[PDB]
């Protein structure tokens, strides 16, 4: 029938000479079945019956791609949900669809005298809202779009930066590997997971010494005539103390979603379970932040946003030493007092008997 298939040629055709050259060197018993299968309908539920302006390829409201309706009167196009109200694709607008702006223009007939007239009219009607009047008039004349934070508030924090499509990314995201997929198809089998090659991953690059494991204190390098004693050292991204994949029991290389954090970073949330919430601010970076040194260093409590030194409330090591001793000794005192009241109620109920 002459149409080529996966094999390279028509189906009713043997191999060409090029393939056979570069690919060469120079009764059964399931006849049965319609005799042994007998139907099963033993199941319990067998009772159940059973002008040519070219339009865009972007949602100019959200600047991402999708299945979108295009405009008959301006080149701007939106996804079917990005309208006010959003339009169902099953019941499309019968005829030409006109965007907010072109519908606006043809409603105003390209005459600004009527614009100022109807503005005066509108501000005449609702003197109740005489202040917001301009905006109340103009709202129906601007094409929709998703809500982007004003940059003057994205700047208050430095560790808050937008992703590719306008998404929150608080620097705990590793990076856009992109070209690493070309790297993923490595000419020599040395793929990302680092299998069967850990000679120079156990050794610091700049310094040149060995990466020790905080929990077992051995860079187990094995011997690449005998590799069955390596142990896959990996280093954190924040503190960089190198850990074994067998001490922090996880078994994978966190390489795609985020950066890995050791078990040596304190909280970033609480869940008191008796269930209260956060104990940490955000990074109120720059000049604007105010550091405040206490005048009292023993029973000032104030927060959990402390900063240690030799509104963020600075403190010294010996101070927290004292405060933890206070916690410990008050806790032992109250525990002793609880045992005391327990035993004294016991003695009262005994002497009553």
């Amino acid at each position: 029938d002459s149409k080529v298939s996966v094999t390279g040629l028509p189906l009713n055709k043997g191999p060409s000479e090029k393939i056979k050259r570069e690919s060469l060197w120079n009764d059964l018993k399931t006849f049965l079945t319609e005799n042994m299968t007998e139907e099963s309908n033993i199941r319990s539920t067998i009772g159940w019956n059973g002008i040519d302006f070219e339009n865009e390829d972007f949602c100019s409201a959200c600047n991402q791609s999708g299945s979108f309706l295009c405009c008959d009167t301006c080149p701007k196009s939106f996804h079917f949900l990005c309208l006010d109200p959003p339009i169902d694709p099953n019941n499309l607008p019968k005829g030409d669809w006109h965007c907010n702006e072109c519908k606006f223009k043809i409603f105003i007939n390209n005459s600004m005298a009527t614009l100022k007239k109807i503005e005066s009219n509108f501000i005449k009607q609702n003197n109740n809202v005489k202040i917001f009047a301009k905006l109340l008039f103009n709202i129906d004349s601007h094409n929709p779009k998703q809500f982007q934070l004003p940059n003057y508030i994205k700047e208050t924090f430095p560790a808050v930066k937008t992703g590719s499509r306008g998404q929150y990314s608080d620097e705990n995201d590793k990076i856009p590997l992109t070209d690493r997929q070309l790297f993923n198809t490595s000419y020599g089998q040395s793929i990302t997971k680092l299998d069967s090659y850990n000679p120079d991953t156990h050794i610091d690059s700049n310094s040149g010494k060995f990466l020790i494991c905080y929990k077992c204190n051995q860079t187990r390098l094995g011997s690449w005539s005998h590799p069955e004693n390596s142990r896959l050292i990996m280093t954190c991204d924040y503190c960089q103390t190198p850990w074994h994949l067998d001490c922090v029991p996880r078994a994978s290389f966190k390489n795609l979603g985020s950066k890995w954090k050791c078990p040596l970073h304190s909280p970033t949330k609480v869940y008191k379970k008796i269930y209260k919430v956060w104990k940490k601010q955000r990074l109120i970076n720059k000049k604007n932040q105010l550091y405040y040194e206490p005048l009292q260093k023993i029973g000032y409590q104030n927060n959990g946003n402390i900063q240690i030194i030799p509104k963020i409330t600075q403190i010294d090591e010996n101070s927290i030493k004292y405060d933890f001793f206070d916690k410990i000794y008050k806790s032992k005192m109250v525990q002793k007092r609880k045992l005391f009241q327990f035993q004294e109620s016991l003695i009262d109920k005994l002497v009553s008997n």
Binding site: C239, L264, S266, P267, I306, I308, I320, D323, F324, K327
Partner: peptide
């Protein structure tokens, strides 16, 4: 006394400064 020895042992064992800062931050949070 022996608790001063506790905290000095911690300062030496945990070794690095940043990690001791983290230890103290945990201790203060508690």
């Amino acid at each position: 006394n022996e608790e001063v020895t506790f905290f000095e042992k911690a300062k030496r064992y945990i070794g690095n400064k940043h990690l001791y800062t983290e230890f103290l931050k945990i201790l203060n949070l508690y």
